[PDB]
Design a protein around this ligand. Structure first.
Ligand SMILES: CCCN(CCC)C(=O)c1cc(C)cc(C(=O)N[C@@H](Cc2cc(F)cc(F)c2)[C@@H](O)CNCc2cccc(OC)c2)c1
Length: 395
């Protein structure tokens, strides 16, 4: 054996927030620096910040107060799965207080109009799209923040995320004081995970696309054409709460999860991810819910590995409408019409390494994943898997 050291203490514990409202990191924009909390989103590629008054904002980017502000004289529109905003493009000096000790000039979309974007009480005022230029708006000529970072400094072309779910509800005061995780810019901090890191190839450099080759519910093969699992794509996305699955896969998965948890009957509203279910304080029946294993393509030919999540991950802690002492949760898995989305829910169980330089994504059991005395999340390998390329979808 050998104890693994944590070499990025300055960036450890630099995140705050929760799955339902998003995880954010502190950043500064302009000269003098204007502090803003920014949502970490591996599912988009635009750096955008509120730049005008809004009901849900306590602060915003004030361009006229920045001596280093540069107007690009260009508008920008970004529509997400849910949520959208319109803004004005420009560049300015950006820094990350609890990140690498550097300052870089990056593109910034000054949000002037929005709909269902900002979240009341999230405590964040903007978003950091960490994906590739291909999906950046207006087009791929608008260099993403991380690309600027790497091009302008010596920071390694890699970042890692440790999203830490509390395992229980956090009120407004609590979520503000609590440590929500870590975003290590330019490296891998070994104190953030246990066990080994397994890498799956980044299929294409647009979203952080990966390939799922097998799915199990308590060891039982969901037994679908693996191509179904990646229809029309599978991505790792910190900006979305739930595990989102292709319609057909969702239907099959819910049927299996229901069968595994059949000793307890849950209302349709629960399975739709709409209504919460509650249990007397401390009696949540974790054991009746199955673990979910997702096999991912490995870096070695015909080899895969699997990540296993617990219901402590796919059941999201929520406060009871009556703020009682019961432990309540919502089913954090929903259907998609745009492929698989490995959201915040899933990421909370693992330390995820976005190794841009080597075009791969690594997974390891998170040092902060919620579990019980009987089961733990896992990252295991290797497995002999054939024709994995056929699992990928082509339009
Ligand atoms: C995370 C806080 C809770 N929310 C939002 C409030 C209900 C969700 O769980 C959620 C739910 C759905 C169902 C989509 C998105 C969604 O679109 N997320 C965005 C980021 C985000 C947007 C927002 F408006 C508010 C937020 F908090 C977070 C990206 O992760 C999407 N990546 C894929 C994609 C899809 C289409 C276009 C695209 O552009 C490149 C990227 C987010």
């Amino acid at each position: 054996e050998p104890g693994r050291r944590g070499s990025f203490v300055e960036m450890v514990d630099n995140l705050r927030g929760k799955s339902g409202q998003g995880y954010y990191v502190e950043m500064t924009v302009g000269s003098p620096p204007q502090t803003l909390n920014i949502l970490v989103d591996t599912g988009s590629s635009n750096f955008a910040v509120g730049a005008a008054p809004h009901p849900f904002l306590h602060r915003y980017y004030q361009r006229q107060l920045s001596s280093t502000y540069r107007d690009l004289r260009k508008g920008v529109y970004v529509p997400y799965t849910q949520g959208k905003w319109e803004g004005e493009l420009g560049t300015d000096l950006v820094s990350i207080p609890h990140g690498p000790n550097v300052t870089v000039r990056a593109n910034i979309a000054a949000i002037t109009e929005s709909d269902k974007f900002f979240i009341n009480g999230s405590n964040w005022e903007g978003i950091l799209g960490l994906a590739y230029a291909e999906i950046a708006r207006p087009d791929d000529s608008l260099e993403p923040f991380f690309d600027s970072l790497v091009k302008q400094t010596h920071v390694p072309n890699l970042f890692s995320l440790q999203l830490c779910g509390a395992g229980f509800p956090l009120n407004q005061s609590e979520v503000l004081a609590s440590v929500g995780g870590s975003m290590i810019i330019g490296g891998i901090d070994h104190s953030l995970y246990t066990g080994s890191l397994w890498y799956t190839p980044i299929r294409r450099e647009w979203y952080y696309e990966v390939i799922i080759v097998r799915v199990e519910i308590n060891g039982q093969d969901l037994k679908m054409d693996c191509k179904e699992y990646n229809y029309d794509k599978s991505i790792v996305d910190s900006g979305t709460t739930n595990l989102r699955l292709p319609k057909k896969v969702f239907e099959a998965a819910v049927k299996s999860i229901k069968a595994a948890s059949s000793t307890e009957k849950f209302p349709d509203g629960f399975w739709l991810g709409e209504q919460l279910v509650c249990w007397q304080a401390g009696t949540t029946p974790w054991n009746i819910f199955p673990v979910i294993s997702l096999y991912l393509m490995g870096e070695v030919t015909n080899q895969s590995f699997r990540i296993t999540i617990l219901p402590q991950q796919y059941l999201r802690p929520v406060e009871d409408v009556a703020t009682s002492q019961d432990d309540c949760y919502k089913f954090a898995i929903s259907q998609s019409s745009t492929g698989t989305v490995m959201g915040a829910v899933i990421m909370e169980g693992f330390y995820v390494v976005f190794d841009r330089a080597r075009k791969r994504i690594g997974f390891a059991v998170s040092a902060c994943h919620v579990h019980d005395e009987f089961r733990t999340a896992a990252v295991e390998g290797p497995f002999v898997t054939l024709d994995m390329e056929d699992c990928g979808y082509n339009i």
